[PDB]
Scaffold this motif. Sequence first.
Motif, short mmCIF file in Angstrom:
data_model
loop_
_atom_site.label_atom_id
_atom_site.label_comp_id
_atom_site.label_asym_id
_atom_site.label_seq_id
_atom_site.Cartn_x
_atom_site.Cartn_y
_atom_site.Cartn_z
N UNK A 56 123.38 17.05 54.09
CA UNK A 56 123.41 18.43 53.67
C UNK A 56 122.44 18.54 52.51
N UNK A 57 121.47 19.42 52.61
CA UNK A 57 120.47 19.50 51.58
C UNK A 57 119.95 20.92 51.47
N UNK A 58 119.68 21.31 50.24
CA UNK A 58 119.06 22.58 49.94
C UNK A 58 119.17 22.88 48.45
N UNK A 59 118.63 24.03 48.02
CA UNK A 59 118.65 24.36 46.60
C UNK A 59 120.03 24.76 46.11
N UNK A 119 130.39 9.04 55.34
CA UNK A 119 130.02 9.72 56.59
C UNK A 119 128.86 10.62 56.44
N UNK A 120 128.35 10.73 55.21
CA UNK A 120 127.24 11.64 54.95
C UNK A 120 126.87 11.80 53.47
N UNK A 121 125.77 12.49 53.25
CA UNK A 121 125.23 12.68 51.94
C UNK A 121 124.96 14.16 51.71
N UNK A 122 125.15 14.61 50.47
CA UNK A 122 124.90 15.98 50.01
C UNK A 122 123.97 15.85 48.81
#
Lengths: 257, 256
Positions: B5-8, B216-219
Amino acid sequence: KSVLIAGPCVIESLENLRSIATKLQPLANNERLDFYFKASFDKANRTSLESYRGPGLEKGLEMLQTIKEEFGYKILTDVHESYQASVAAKVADILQIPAFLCRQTDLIVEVSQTNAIVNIKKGQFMNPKDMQYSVLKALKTRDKSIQSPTYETALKNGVWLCERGSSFGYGNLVVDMRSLKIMREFAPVIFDATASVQMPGSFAPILARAAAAVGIDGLFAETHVDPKNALSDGANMLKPDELEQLVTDMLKIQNLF
Amino acid sequence: KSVLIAGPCVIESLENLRSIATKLQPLANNERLDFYFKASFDKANRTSLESYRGPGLEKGLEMLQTIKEEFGYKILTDVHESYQASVAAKVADILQIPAFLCRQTDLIVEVSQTNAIVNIKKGQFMNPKDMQYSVLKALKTRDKSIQSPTYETALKNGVWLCERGSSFGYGNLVVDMRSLKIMREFAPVIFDATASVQMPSFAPILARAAAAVGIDGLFAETHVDPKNALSDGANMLKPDELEQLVTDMLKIQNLF
């Protein structure tokens, strides 16, 4: 006049409210105190889904109103959402911002646009120095010329800060008595004696005495006629007799200084 | 697939959003990732009255939908209050509960009533074992028969937990890596590597650490040009930094 704010955690029923109101009548007429009766109309952070919620805004304010009329009490209640603020301020003389919401700009702004006193609880991991910014959003709303918050300006404008402890590891609450003094540069300071006792495996009287020795403008305590039969987690609350003694001890201390 | 999950931090302008979206295309097309693009439509806890708020629910959602359409990205956004969830979920594939709201029952129930995946950030002073109760509220909303939260069950019904650190004194934040393991018994776990203490780089290191423990994931908060980010222009990664971090995670995860 030192401020005393007292009442049950949540509104349970009209009769329970009347019962605790009655037990607090002698405290309420004490001319050395500025008394406010408290009760939450919602329990937003209840342990589980089937946990008691409280009566909700509309029925809860009706109930607090009835207490104000029958006992002559000023009222404090808390607000979790912006749009509750205006209607609550028609019954409540103080609107309280919960600790977890103490940086929420819109909430602070809306609450500060009402005519109520604003009591901002200090977040459990907030540095007391950083509470100046929350006081200032409220003050600026009430007087847009204020640039920095001070005790005298917060007092004239009805904005207060409340100490309820800091998180200390997991599942523990510690009261840094220094914060009482630090926050008092910015605003009047109320000490929440019953929130702040919690250790894993009562201390409320002894911390209230410590707080009174340091210098506070008032005391906040959750109080129930019969804690074993309360619809909260009943662990935090004082009985009326217990609170009377605590208040007796604070005033003796305060009269030394 | 591991989730990214990525964004500003906040929606600054459509062109800024389009710009960050463009730079994330390589990661969005990565076969080993299940990618979501994020951005808040509102910054509810800004330190001053004058500080930038974001565009609001209506206009912010419209902007995110435009990204969804133009880039084909699934979307994460956060909700702060009542009656946002149902409308947000028409655009967002993931609805996030911020950390300070992680015990707010009505908010959990409401978000869990939508078709969205639910991402519950762990409060900065929560014991990780106590996050099981937030998961259970969300799970019971989606299936009344569930009595106890479990990874398998949380995965099937779209309820995730997210690690963002724990307060350590005043003005400092610490990641207890044990929480990644503890919380994973209850639900899939995302690690928020850009976790930082707000003030009214160690991100790659903690990410590698967390990948080695098991996540399970990265932010990650990411911006094309962090120094000109409307907030907070101190803690975001650049797109190329994020790529490096993603590369190292996949290698570490590939050992196991």
